[PDB]
Nucleic acid binder design. Structure first.
Lengths: 700, 300
DNA sequence: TTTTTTTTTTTTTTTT
């Protein structure tokens, strides 16, 4: 028999009772689906976690979906409870979903997540066939739905339908009034007639679901649509995004018929159209709510489009690196280029809610117009299939990129960022979606010229990439940070490390003195230096923090199209559901390191000589940068270009890695008893793998 | 040159080590302030004092604000260590504040307080300019502040401002509701509209800064403002008190915006106003925290 | 005592 069935029979007739199971045999996790925790008593002092998770264990005989007790949510937060792990259940309890007629829900009250399972069989049947239903929904609570395991803007599950194709509708007997006319007469007329518009901007999803509120699929997406008489902001309400979101895209002629015109929202701004001729309507807004007969939205095909209507054409503000160099800040633009680098999918905490996160990742889009790549801060645009599976050597096109500039720092910062109404599309060979635009044709011409010339731009994927480089002087660094939180204590650092969540990144500043720096030939005369101060105070340290370890996934690795899937999966966000690995995968140490140096280990003794720490120094600058003076100092972590070397062909005479390592060690030795201000980078790679890499050493 | 300079140069390179000063020269106390003793280990059976003291001993040349070892607070409880006295420091130590960029701090660890000085100079320069920063703050801690020397219900220091003046806020399109309106509708109002209240009673300050919890300006004052017939016990939190307490007098017409509404604190005792005709709303209370823009509190 | 941010809302009259 199966441990699942044994436990179920053991605790089936004692609902909501904590019962240690008779026998504990490891079970295999196969999925972790997240959803909102609702219908629980929030009066409790430890406010219930905002979200709860369902774990789909398997026992070799049957696989059953379990509801993890929210008290254990920290395990999923730190990615300890992965997919395909050998967890052992120490406590179990039953629970009946009164909103449904089914069986008990095995509740995992206590667990001991272990190691990976060598036998991950997804062919096992489901003990409770209700669990194996086509629409994958949460165990508890009416018509509940699942959210993306990490962020709230990524569509996830099966409710997100993608089967809305154009339909031929005859417009005879239809009025299709102009948007300006509607703006004039939306406060008097009763039956708002039809509208023929074209989507010009599609924005990310917005999850406004709150606990203990009678809300069903609380999603809203903002669409800007334009006709021959202006443009308006169209908003899709809950229960409509699931059916239409994955299908609606920019450039689709829609026929909205039964809508609701409201006064518009003052806390949300309407993006300016690419073509200024389009008159902007700001006093009006169109709300699309799900209706009984699904006719409120119709995707009119292009073939039916008549020039007589003169519908506005989807334009684009495509920009090239050279042009971007001359564009003021906050000047929206579009970028088409070749992905020559992709970074980890890091996460940041929303400033509004402490339990929500943004998923972002840095990518160096590049073109033939300049020698520097577009640095784009790619936040999730509710396009997980493209965002998660993005790889170098791909023609990438984003839609709405706000320009961000900072000239105070000596390394002038010029990186683009994705806006709310942005979009991501991967292009293939000649411009697939945007061939007509001349800039796309020029980019394709450059691609062909490079291909026939035998030149290939260097490619990288993943790694430790703290793009924003701290300024050259601590005063300028602190000009933005508050005085009370500017610095921390070497002792308090431990809590900072222990507070981060999956891929949450943090930057802290610590006051101390470099005591001993050691060089670790990383890839496959003096490498260690010790300070007399260290030899004296090493025996009187209260707590010597040891975080000078570099993980294999923090080393950027040169991309290889053949191992594309493996390389991508080694740096994406943790998948929600297990998927068996094709054949055997290679070793993450089997790929060449895009870096060009070995990592050092820096020991810092606090100003009071009581506490110490061991950070790891991971410079990303090549010796050519040293020779041409593209680095503020040898103790920094980035060259000014903030980009990896391209087709390195000039290291024949330049000092080798060992010479640069000796220079770095000597520079560190120059700071013997000097109170320096280190800038550390704390990133938690999940599964209790927190990397603490040094960024900059601000000397007096 | 000076005793201060000699001792500091002697003990700068040995933080958290106790060294008898090379020379013991009487030094005049020119100031004595009191602040919370957080960041100390509360695991010792003799729990360290809830407050520590900073003494601005002055030599003939300079005066450098020092730190009094909490074990010496007995000399201040009896007022034996007062301003204007002459004392002979016997033990010193160097401590570095890890939340500020600055030089070492002299840690007084044993004194022999004598008698009043014959000549006290208030014009002696400050050796360390950091000590001379106009918004005076305690030597230890990041955003710490000095309390009053003896009682905790008296504003003290430069954090307390009196610069607030009446402002002519236009009421062209300001949505002003009544207190009873919130009383009936405050659990459904996603946004709480503006208010136009008038102060009736202003309470004495209350310091709730415990040593272990990390709080900034643990100052809290309860103001009984009454808009229209209704009256509620508004309560200002955190660092809002030392920006509006020395300025707000009873009878000032306040315009509170971007506020919060919650349940009345269980042990709260709302005072009855002079006029009985008013309604004493005692179910919900408006909390005024420091919003990033300075529009939350505007007096008309 | 402490404690912040976010959106959601459907419907049968007028003629002068």
């Amino acid at each position: 028999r199966s441990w699942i069935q044994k436990v179920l029979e053991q605790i089936m007739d004692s609902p909501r009772q904590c019962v240690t199971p008779s026998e504990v045999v490891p079970v295999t996790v196969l999925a972790v689906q997240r959803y909102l925790l609702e219908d629980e008593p929030r009066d409790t002092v430890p406010k219930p976690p905002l979200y709860c998770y369902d774990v789909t264990i398997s026992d070799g005989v049957y696989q059953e979906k379990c509801y993890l007790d929210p008290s254990l949510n920290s395990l999923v937060y730190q990615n300890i409870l992965k997919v395909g792990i050998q967890m052992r259940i120490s406590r179990v309890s039953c629970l009946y979903n009164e909103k449904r007629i089914g069986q008990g829900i095995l509740c995992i009250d206590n667990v001991h997540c272990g190691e990976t399972s060598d036998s991950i069989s997804l062919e096992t049947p489901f003990r409770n066939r209700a669990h194996q239903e086509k629409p994958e929904r949460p165990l508890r609570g009416g018509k509940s739905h699942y959210l993306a395991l990490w962020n709230n803007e990524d569509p996830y599950g099966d409710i997100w339908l993608t089967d809305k194709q154009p339909e031929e509708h005859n417009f005879s007997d239809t009025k299709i009034i102009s948007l300006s006319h509607l703006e004039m007469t939306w406060t008097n007329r009763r039956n708002f007639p039809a509208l023929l518009v074209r989507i010009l901007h599609k924005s990310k999803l917005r999850y406004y679901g709150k606990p203990d509120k009678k809300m069903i699929e609380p999603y809203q997406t903002f669409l800007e649509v334009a006709d021959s008489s202006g443009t308006v902001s169209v908003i899709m309400w809950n229960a409509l995004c699931p059916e239409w979101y994955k299908s609606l895209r920019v450039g689709l002629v829609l026929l909205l018929q039964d809508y609701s015109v409201k006064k518009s929202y003052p806390f949300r701004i309407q993006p300016v159209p690419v073509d200024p001729q389009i008159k902007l309507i700001s006093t009006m807004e169109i709300c699309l709510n799900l209706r009984d007969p699904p006719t409120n939205i119709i995707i009119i095909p292009e073939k039916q489009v008549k020039p007589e209507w003169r519908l506005p054409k989807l334009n684009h503000r495509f920009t090239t690196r050279s042009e971007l160099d001359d564009m003021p800040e906050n000047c929206i633009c579009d970028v088409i280029g070749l992905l020559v680098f992709v970074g980890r999918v890091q996460r940041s905490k929303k400033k509004e809610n402490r339990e929500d996160f943004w998923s972002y990742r840095w990518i160096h889009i590049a073109d033939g117009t300049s020698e520097q790549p577009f640095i784009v801060e790619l936040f999730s645009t509710s396009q997980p299939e493209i965002f998660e599976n993005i790889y170098p050597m791909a023609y990438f096109v984003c839609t709405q990129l706000k320009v961000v500039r900072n000239d105070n720092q000596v390394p002038k910062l010029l990186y683009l960022t994705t806006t709310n109404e942005s979009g991501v599309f991967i292009t293939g060979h000649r411009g697939q979606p945007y061939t007509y635009d001349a800039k796309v044709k020029n980019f394709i011409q450059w691609i062909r010229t490079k291909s026939d010339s035998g030149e290939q731009k260097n490619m990288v994927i993943g790694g430790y990439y703290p793009y924003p480089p701290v300024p050259e002087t601590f005063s300028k660094y602190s000009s933005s940070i508050k005085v009370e939180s500017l610095l921390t204590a070497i002792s308090e650092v431990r809590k900072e490390i222990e507070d981060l969540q999956y891929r949450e990144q943090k930057r802290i500043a610590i006051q101390g003195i470099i005591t001993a720096i050691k060089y670790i030939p990383h890839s496959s005369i003096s490498d260690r230096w010790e300070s007399q101060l260290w030899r004296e105070k090493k025996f009187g340290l209260i707590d010597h923090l040891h975080y000078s370890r570099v993980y294999p996934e923090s080393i950027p690795r040169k991309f290889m199209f053949e191992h594309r899937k493996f390389l991508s999966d080694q740096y994406n966000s943790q998948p929600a559901k297990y998927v068996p690995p094709e054949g055997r995968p290679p070793k993450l140490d089997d790929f060449k390191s895009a870096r060009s140096l070995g990592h050092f280990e820096v020991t810092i003794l606090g100003l009071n000589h009581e506490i110490a720490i061991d950070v790891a120094f991971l410079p990303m600058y090549c010796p050519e940068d040293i020779r041409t003076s593209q680095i503020d100092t040898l103790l920094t972590s980035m060259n000014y270009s903030c980009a990896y070397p391209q087709d390195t062909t000039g290291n024949d005479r330049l000092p080798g890695p060992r010479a640069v390592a000796g220079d770095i060690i000597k520079a560190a030795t120059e700071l013997d008893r000097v109170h320096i201000v280190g800038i550390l980078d704390i990133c938690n790679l999940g599964n209790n793998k927190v990397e603490v890499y040094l960024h900059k050493i601000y000397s007096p």
